[PDB]
Amino acid sequence: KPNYALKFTLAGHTKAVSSVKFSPNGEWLASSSADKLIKIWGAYDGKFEKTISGHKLGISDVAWSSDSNLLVSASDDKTLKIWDVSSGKCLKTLKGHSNYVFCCNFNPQSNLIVSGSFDESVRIWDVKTGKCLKTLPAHSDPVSAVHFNRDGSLIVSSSYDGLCRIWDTASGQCLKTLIDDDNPPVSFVKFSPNGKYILAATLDNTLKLWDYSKGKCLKTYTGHKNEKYCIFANFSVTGGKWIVSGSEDNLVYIWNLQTKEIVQKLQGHTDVVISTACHPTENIIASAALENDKTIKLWKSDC
């Protein structure tokens, strides 16, 4: 069992925080917010670094390039923006979605960005040019999450339509549609680190690990509350192998991936924990909460 303990509370976003992510080089945490801003913080000391501004409406997601130099952000202003972190410059504004952009991610080579939108589409963008390369007719309801696999050859998407879909990056073809009894809205999805599984959150207070190729649910994680928000989930791999998620009861939940038992609940946020992130090399977790709290917390364990 881990022993995550609070180390720092990071404050100053003026509205709900939407997403927190650690830079791949482990040096930084980036946060996005309904306040239309991105903030950068020291990953190990929680020290505020800088604010990055330019979106015209709130931002629901942010993601780092593999070399930790760029960010992409997804906004209700219907665009994504690519940012040079050290200069703060907006390098490109990605236009094409017809509604809120909700989620985003770079591929491992970082030459592509994938986005999902309330317009029900998934779009694949060229980083260098800013051009949309493909528009996938992915879902029949808002797209809640998009993620590339370890070698970038696949994209997984999730939707309120109750489905998770696997896409061939090169062709745009849908290679798989995952179906689960009752088709509860899917609020989050991501590949496992080895790319063999996908972790999916549904708005019925449940997280599941799936062997998507075979359409077999291998694990189910419950105990938390998730019925209204798209809460991030994660695979913790620097120490023990955990599943980490936020929750609508203001707690961070940690489960043993194999046993499915809850091994820790982290307390002291005062609103829904919308986002959690796991450091790439240290046993550190970042968490972020909604409007009534607006703080980010950094927790650290010995294992």
Partner: peptide
């Protein structure tokens, strides 16, 4: 916004 809730189905 992700920060705003989806009314659960009735």
């Amino acid at each position: 916004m992700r920060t705003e809730p989806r009314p659960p189905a009735p």
